[PDB]
């Protein structure tokens, strides 16, 4: 993920290499653009 | 030759490109260059607009020069492909933006059999011009002899080639037909006294994308 | 004893863009959750092809208006992303981080006269090599669709990749005179009482449309 | 293909309407984590450097697609040329405590300092605009400070970056037909 | 054996044909992918250099051999001595990027820096001969370009060659009946 | 602690035909599909056997004429990837950039005069120790073939690799007068009406034909 | 492959160290000298 490339483990634990995330109780771009509409609305001749 | 008096046996070769044939009798084969069969014709540059066009795929002629005693080793006529057409494929070039084929080259040499020297053919992917030195290892390229002890006509096949899928070729030839002197034409006594080459030329797989509006 | 290694020269320098990470100093730090948050996009084409964004006419605005001449051009314009009538497109904006693209490229065109006003239109794609169609005679050659005005309002047409190269490039070249991936050519074939009413054009990316090799351009 | 343009449901055509192929597209160098994800240069000032994204300048790649998110998420690298020992605070702290070394605190080694830092804001997510005055963002919109006898370059990197509601992108405004530059090309 | 010589089809004889026996051959040292993967240097210009293997000049056994094909493919490494931050942009680049340092830029470190680069070019492989203007290649044909304050010295290094279509590869002609050097040998 | 490491004295230097790679900067290029492109080659010495290139004689053309004295030799030459006579060769083009070889070299001998010229032909291999023949008499005694005219235009024969040492240079020294791999003699036995004819000869690698020990010895 | 000559593992994933070749839809010198007359083209005496 990222512009990363090593493919060793990193030295230092995750708790210490970046800020942790937390939960409480998504790509909404990437549905919008999926959800695009490709056909044709009317008869097709030919 | 290996075949069998006069040019024969399995040296009988006829070939067809579309409603065109051309038929010798002192064949001594064809030359596959590079590869026996076309890489890809569909690939992301042309978006699946490109289409076929089997009309064009047939023989054209032209003229390469004439082979005198007083031509020397080394002496060269270059014709670039693909060249002035005035047919269907030459049509073609001012209907279409992108272009591919590939070419089944032809090019003949008639004396008789008392004539001597010997030139070599050869179809050569981008070139403009050889050094003198280049020309010693003109055989690294798809190439045949003309030899008229044993026969007088060359024929090399090649695919399309070139750093593009498809070409533009108002800008740019890939491939150059070369004829080169290797040993100087002796006529003897009963020997033709000058030995015109002439080429027969078909167009091979030709694929067309990207039509242009009329001058209209 | 202990390991030996050989300090290699040419290797070590920071590298702006290198494929490694830091060491930290600072730890055991957890953040508010931001979980389920609105509006979130992974990819800059995601929302390229998703929103499509306005051309630019003579005169700055985002269309052209019916003509009543013998004159059928609407816009005739460079397929290029560097063309000042893509100049205020989100796509342009994008394009200018990457040196090629390839792919479909989609206009869109919206008609906004009366009820009473009424037009039938012509987009065609002209590539390079001859000059560009200056009727829809001539252009009815080349790759082309017309379309009606009515009920819908819009109408959408992908302009095709077409080229020798794989990939194009994004920026154009002080040397090249023509523009070297061709025209868009958009003509009015007739209308009937559409006197001034504008047809509004917009662009978003197709399906295929790729941008490849992140660039650093601008001065300013 | 026809459509009520009205509405904002995207319509996506393909060249299959009139015969052609859609081709298969690879998007990795547009996804937002690995674009943001490489150093950009700011122009430092001579001591106390707040840890700001908002520094980068508007035109960079960086600094340009930044702008392009409302809200957006992070954690850093920076990357510093300096004099002296160069101490970080984490965003809240008072000023005063960027002279006491017990806070990050890394001794000079030419020829510069490279540290990755967590993301420390207050909260869920910063943004690059903020309608609040209406220029100036709130105070903790920052991701703490920094400060060294002497900060000559200071490069900042995003990792792991988050963009939410996207905002104008734009381009060159040419004044002829198309924008043309000088591309790289063999010589002569 | 005798053979029809006018047919391009190869004729390999052996020397079984008069009672010898061929033996075992091992050519990894003619393997194309091998021999081309060593460093060979050119003359820098002093800040901008387009990355262009033609500058190899052609008498050496790197530039020689890529003549010696018409289309080719590699993936790059470059060594260079330099003053000041080495930025390289990639094929397409207008000329400008190579005072952005985001572009993948080196901070000098003595004595040199030595760089992995991707082949960028549009096209599927490049040429060393393209009969275009009938020299000239067109401005395409590049692996990108670099910029320091100063280069002083280049070096290139083609990874994962592959070459199509053999061309011409010319010795020295000699004057006399054999070219005779000074070889290398044990002293007086 | 950490774990620690003797930077070793004599290591680590950049050195240009290293078998290590450089440290990656830009990742995730893909490149346009090459699959299936015609001609390739993966070893040059393919290429050399495959193809066989032209032999220079005196005067600067690529054949021998019959002779018509009482002198039978058509060609006399060193046998040596340096001679004058190879010199417009692929085979001493590849030579020149390894220093030692290796196996067989073919000649190849093609007739182009008439159907009414007819000749007979000699090739001999004679080895270093003993000047080479000048007769086809004092030839026989060496390794040799003999083959006249016909339906086959082309006589191939290989020149035997023959030495003390398992490898021989590819470049002459300028001590050594004489060549130590000995000469190729090419005679005419005698023609039938072939005055002028020419014979066109041609070189090609063997089978067992190697080149090793890279070496980049031009200064131009 | 090449002139390289490490046993052990790069450090860097390929999808850094080198561009990554892609396929549409073969060595060409080598098939051509494998094909080579290498017998006797007539008959053989002694």
């Known amino acids: 993920s990222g512009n ?19 939960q409480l109780g998504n790509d909404w771009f990437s549905k919008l653009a999926s959800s695009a509409f490709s056909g044709l609305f009317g008869a097709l001749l030919a | 030759d290996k075949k069998t008096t006069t040019l024969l046996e399995d040296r009988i070769l006829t070939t067809r490109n579309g409603h065109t044939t051309s038929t010798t009798q002192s064949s001594v084969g064809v030359t596959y260059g590079y590869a026996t069969a076309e890489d890809f014709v569909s690939g992301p540059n042309t978006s699946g607009l490109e289409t076929r066009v089997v009309q064009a795929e047939r023989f054209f002629k032209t003229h390469l020069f004439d082979w005198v005693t007083s031509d020397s080793f080394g002496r060269c006529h270059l014709l670039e492909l693909p060249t002035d057409h005035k047919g269907v494929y030459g049509s073609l070039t001012d209907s279409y933006a992108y272009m591919r084929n590939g070419w089944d080259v032809e090019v003949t040499a008639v004396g008789n059999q008392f004539n001597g020297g010997c030139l070599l053919v050869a179809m050569v992917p981008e070139l403009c011009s050889i050094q003198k030195r280049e020309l010693y290892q003109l055989t690294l390229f798809p190439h045949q002899f003309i030899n008229p002890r044993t026969n007088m006509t060359a024929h090399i096949t090649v695919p399309f080639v070139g750093v593009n899928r498809y070409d533009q070729y108002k800008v740019h030839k890939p491939w150059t037909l070369v004829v080169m002197v290797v040993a100087p034409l002796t006529v003897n006594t009963e020997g033709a006294p000058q030995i015109k080459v002439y080429a027969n030329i078909a167009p091979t797989n030709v694929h067309v994308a990207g039509e242009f509006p009329s001058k209209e | 004893g202990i390991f030996p290694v050989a300090c290699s020269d040419g290797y070590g320098g920071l590298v702006t863009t290198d494929p490694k990470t830091a060491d930290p100093v600072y730890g055991k730090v957890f953040n508010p959750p931001r979980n389920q948050l609105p509006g979130r996009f992974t990819n800059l084409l995601d929302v390229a092809e998703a929103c499509p964004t306005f051309l630019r006419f003579e005169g700055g605005v985002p269309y052209v208006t019916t003509k009543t001449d013998s004159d059928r051009v609407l816009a005739q314009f460079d397929m290029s992303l560097a063309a000042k009538h893509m100049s205020n497109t989100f796509l342009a904006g994008l394009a200018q981080y990457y040196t090629q693209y390839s792919g479909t490229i989609n206009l869109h065109f919206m008609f906004t006269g009366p009820t009473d006003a009424k037009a039938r239109y012509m987009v065609a794609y002209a590539p390079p090599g001859m000059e560009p169609p200056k009727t829809p005679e001539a252009a009815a050659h080349c790759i082309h669709a017309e379309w009606d005005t009515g009920l819908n309002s819009k109408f959408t047409f992908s302009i095709p990749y077409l080229s020798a190269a794989d990939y194009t490039y994004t920026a154009s070249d002080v040397a090249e005179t023509t523009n070297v991936q061709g025209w868009v050519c958009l003509f009015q074939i007739t209308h009937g009482k559409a006197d001034g009413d504008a047809l509004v054009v917009l662009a978003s990316a197709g399906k295929d449309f790729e941008l490849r090799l992140p660039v650093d351009a601008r001065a300013e | 293909t026809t459509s009520a343009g009205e509405s904002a449901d995207p319509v996506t055509t393909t060249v299959e309407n009139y ?48 702008r392009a998110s409302t809200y957006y998420f992070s954690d850093l690298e920076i990357a510093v040329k300096h004099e002296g020992d160069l101490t970080w605070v984490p965003n809240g702290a008072p000023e005063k405590a960027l002279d006491n070394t017990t806070n990050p605190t890394a001794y000079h080694k030419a020829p510069l300092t490279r540290l990755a830092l967590p993301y420390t804001a207050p909260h869920r997510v910063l943004a690059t605009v903020y309608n609040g005055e209406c220029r100036t963002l709130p105070t903790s919109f920052n991701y703490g400070a920094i400060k060294a006898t002497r900060v000559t370059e200071l490069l900042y990197r995003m990792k792991r970056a988050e963009t939410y509601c996207p905002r104008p992108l734009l381009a060159i405004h040419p004044t002829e037909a198309r924008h043309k530059q000088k591309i790289v090309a063999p010589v002569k």
Chains 1, 7 share one sequence.
């Open chain 1, 4 to 22: 990363t490339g090593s493919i060793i483990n990193n030295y230092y634990m995750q708790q210490y290499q970046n800020s942790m995330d937390t």
């Open chain 4, 19 to 66: 015969g052609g192929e859609t081709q298969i597209q690879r998007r990795q160098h547009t996804d937002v984590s690995f674009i943001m994800d490489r150093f950009v240069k700011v122009t430092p000032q001579n001591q106390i450097n707040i840890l700001d994204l908002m520094q980068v300048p508007s035109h960079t790649l960086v600094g340009a697609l930044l």
